[PDB]
Each structure stands twice: as structure tokens, then as C-alpha cells.
Design an enzyme around this catalytic site. Structure first.
Site, PDB file in Angstrom:
ATOM      1  N   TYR B  93      34.798  53.056  36.736  1.00 12.48           N
ATOM      2  CA  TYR B  93      34.325  52.107  37.734  1.00 12.48           C
ATOM      3  C   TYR B  93      32.823  51.984  37.626  1.00 12.48           C
ATOM      4  O   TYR B  93      32.121  52.992  37.650  1.00 12.48           O
ATOM      5  CB  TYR B  93      34.733  52.545  39.152  1.00 12.48           C
ATOM      6  N   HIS B 134      33.389  45.654  41.010  1.00 18.36           N
ATOM      7  CA  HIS B 134      33.443  44.652  42.072  1.00 18.36           C
ATOM      8  C   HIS B 134      32.192  43.792  41.999  1.00 18.36           C
ATOM      9  O   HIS B 134      31.117  44.273  41.636  1.00 18.36           O
ATOM     10  CB  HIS B 134      33.576  45.331  43.447  1.00 18.36           C
TER      11      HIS B 134
HETATM   12 CL   LIG Z   1      27.453  41.601  43.057  1.00 18.73          CL
END
Ligand SMILES: [Cl-]
Ligand SMILES: CC(C)(COP(=O)(O)OP(=O)(O)OC[C@H]1O[C@@H](n2cnc3c(N)ncnc32)[C@H](O)[C@H]1OP(=O)(O)O)[C@@H](O)C(=O)NCCC(=O)NCCS
Ligand SMILES: CC(C)(COP(=O)(O)OP(=O)(O)OC[C@H]1O[C@@H](n2cnc3c(N)ncnc32)[C@H](O)[C@H]1OP(=O)(O)O)[C@@H](O)C(=O)NCCC(=O)NCCS
Ligand SMILES: [Cl-]
Lengths: 180, 180
Positions: B93, B134
Site C-alpha cells: 500500500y 488511494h
Molecule cells: Cl490524492
């Protein structure tokens, strides 16, 4: 504010004319600002159960609740209902409960809560087996209030960081009703 | 900044001496402020893989990634790994990727990303089958960067409000590697 204020307090649904007042009160009570559409939503009587307490015509308190089937329960709170309850089983999530500062400790908050509980215990469509809500760990006043009304701490929700934002830590509190 | 800046860029692990600089750069790149311990963490070489790009001794970029087993993937992103993958299967991640503004568009961002991917494709302990991250829906620069490097949009993460705080909407982007 008279000691007898409670006896002259009325209860009624919010309406579109209340929006500006609600915004002002929510701006005073909670640091988190919801979008304008939320305020319309809760004052529309469609998606939410929203009750106001009024005194001499002025809103001095309010409760906003959402009646949810199991698929709309917060994912981290899915287990507030034991696993044998049907998906259609409903709960009430308290989005908001607040009373104007000077009117606090007069039983208004308890009255709003009782009314929510009666609403979801007596009418068929909104019948619920639990009430749950979230409270910041720092909100001692609210924690005592709910615990004195037999809500139990169901979860600690830890602090959360992401590029999308920050969620403070908090508690999930739950009250089981009607066989819940 | 010269077109040839890239040929003179070095890579190194972040260390405790970098914290002040890292904090300052993160303050410029991201609106979300993480607690002080996060900065210590990413400079500590324990839980995170954090690589800096330097030019003439100064940090001009960094990538921070966490290598996670299946049980540490974000709940909403759990499905990035098909159910046939071993539970111990790992992913990386990206917590953070940034380049000093004037040094952008010189291949530094790509270099950091490439380095992350080699780290998790050549060494046994940090071997991964995917990279995910993200991104805010408004960050067109980052979205184009990643999509041009064959990351695919895996999820839309909707806006989220609570008494605990607000999460802006965003995307989960995913790159499958090493047979993932
Ligand atoms: Cl962002
Ligand atoms: C939590 C909150 C909604 C309670 O509202 P409230 O109107 O003050 O609630 P109540 O008056 O029914 O009860 C509070 C306390 O006053 C007491 N009380 C009620 N009437 C009283 C009276 N006539 N004389 C003395 N005390 C009285 C209640 O007994 C006592 O609680 P206790 O039984 O647990 O000891 C309120 O403090 C508030 O608005 N906080 C800010 C908003 C917020 O934090 N929201 C988060 C969700 S709660
Ligand atoms: C997204 C980001 C990290 C990219 O960093 P970067 O150093 O500019 O990345 P690159 O230079 O490798 O690549 C970007 C673009 O410049 C181009 N480029 C690279 N070298 C170039 C050169 N010598 N001349 C002209 N263009 C060049 C890349 O080819 C092009 O990408 P493309 O192939 O998709 O068209 C950067 O804009 C940034 O720091 N943003 C703020 C932080 C942020 O938003 N992070 C999001 C994740 S937390
Ligand atoms: Cl609270």
C-alpha cells in the site's frame, strides 16, 4: 429558564422552514459540518425520523435518527445485532441529539430519546430491535447520559488516517429493545 | 531545474535526521496532518518501506509504502485479491508519494515507483502480488500518472460523514505484479 420548562415543552416533526435554525444549532453543538443536503434531508420527513422539542415556539432541542435494516449498519458495527437476526431486522441510528445549552438538565434530552424509542417500539414499519450511536471518547457529558439510560458500550472505534481524511476515535453505544 | 537532473538523482532510505524535512514536505503536498508518531514510523525503517530521492544532498522526493498480508488490507479494498490467493499473500500500500514541485515531470516520481516495485519483486520477505493506493477524485495529476503506469481503478470510495469526522470521496487504484 424556569425549572418548570419541561411541562411547557412540545414535540413536533422538523419541516423545511426549520433548516436555517437547525443549521445554526448544529453549528453550535457539533464541530463536523454536514453538507447542505443533509439539512434538507432531515427536515423532509422522508428518509429520517427527526423530532424537535420546542419552548414558546422556539426549537430548544432535537433528535435525528435513521431506521436501518442490517445492510445499512456501519460495517464496523455490523455485530451490534447477533448473527441470528434476519437482514430485514431494523435498528435506529442516532445521527444527532442536542439541546440548547441553557435548556440542558431539564429532561428535554431524555424526552427526545424516549420519543424515539416509543416511535420504533409501537409502529410496525419503523419497528426496531436496537438503538445505536457514536460518541467521541472525549464527550463525557454524552457518555454519562447514555450509560445512565442503559446504553452499553459495544465498541471502541480507533483513530483512522487516510489521504481522504481523519476519523477521531470514539465509541459505539447500543440499547437493545423489543427483544433485541 | 536542468533537464538532466534525473541522471544525478540518488536513492536512499529515510532516517531519523530527515523528519524535519519530511514533515515540511508533507505539509506542502497533503492537506491531512498525520500525528508526530507517523513521521517517526516512516523514518524508522521498521513498519514501512520508505525511499527518498535526493539531488545534491537534498530530498526532492519520497515514496512510503506498507507491505501487508491479506488481513491488513483496507476492508473496502479486501477484494483486490481473489479468494484463491494464500492468506499470507502480500500487497504493498502506497501511503505516500511526492516530489518537490519544481522537480516534477523529470522522471523522479516514476523512479521512486519503479524502485518500490523492484523491492517487492526481487526480495523474498517483502514479495508482493499487488500495489494499491488511494487517490482523491480531484487529484487529476496523480490519477493520470498512475493510469499511465497501468494502475487500474478498482473502486470508487464515496464521501463519508460521522461525528468522528469526514472522509472525502476517492479511488482505489491497483497494479497486479508477479503473477497477481
Ligand atoms: Cl490524492
Ligand atoms: C447529551 C444531551 C443531549 C443531554 O440533553 P439534556 O436535555 O441535558 O438531557 P436531560 O436533561 O434529560 O438529562 C441530563 C441530566 O439532567 C438531569 N435532569 C433532568 N431534569 C432535571 C431537573 N429538573 N433537575 C436537575 N436535573 C435534571 C438528568 O437526570 C441528568 O442525567 P442523569 O439522569 O443521567 O443523572 C446534552 O448535554 C447536549 O445537547 N450535548 C451537546 C450535543 C451532543 O453532545 N450530542 C452528542 C449526541 S448526545
Ligand atoms: C504524482 C507525482 C508524484 C508525479 O511525480 P513526478 O516526478 O512528476 O513523476 P514523473 O516525472 O515520473 O512523471 C510525470 C510526467 O512527467 C513526464 N516526464 C518525465 N520526465 C520528463 C522529462 N525529462 N521531460 C518531460 N516530461 C517528463 C512523465 O513522462 C509524465 O508522465 P506520463 O508518462 O504519464 O505522461 C507528483 O505530481 C507529486 O508529487 N504530486 C503531489 C503529491 C501527490 O499528489 N501524491 C499522490 C499520491 S500520495
Ligand atoms: Cl460526540
Amino acid at each position: 429558564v424556569p425549572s418548570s420548562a419541561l411541562s411547557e415543552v412540545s414535540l413536533r416533526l422538523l419541516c423545511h422552514d426549520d433548516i436555517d435554525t437547525v443549521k445554526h444549532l448544529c453549528g453550535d453543538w457539533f464541530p463536523i459540518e454536514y453538507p447542505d443536503s443533509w439539512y434538507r434531508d432531515i427536515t423532509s420527513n422522508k428518509k429520517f425520523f427527526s423530532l424537535a422539542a420546542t419552548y414558546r415556539g422556539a426549537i430548544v432541542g432535537m433528535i435525528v435518527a435513521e431506521i436501518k435494516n442490517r445492510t445499512k449498519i456501519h460495517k464496523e458495527d455490523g455485530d451490534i445485532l447477533a448473527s441470528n437476526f434476519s437482514v430485514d431486522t431494523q435498528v435506529a441510528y442516532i445521527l444527532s441529539l442536542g439541546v440548547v445549552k441553557e435548556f440542558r438538565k431539564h429532561g428535554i434530552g431524555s424526552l427526545l430519546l424516549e420519543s424515539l424509542k416509543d416511535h420504533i417500539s409501537t409502529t410496525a414499519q419503523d419497528h426496531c430491535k436496537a438503538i445505536y450511536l457514536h460518541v467521541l471518547t472525549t464527550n463525557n457529558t454524552a457518555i454519562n447520559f447514555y450509560e445512565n439510560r442503559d446504553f452499553k458500550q459495544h465498541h471502541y472505534l480507533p483513530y483512522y488516517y487516510s489521504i481522504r481524511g481523519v476519523l477521531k476515535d470514539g465509541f459505539t453505544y447500543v440499547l437493545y429493545i423489543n427483544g433485541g
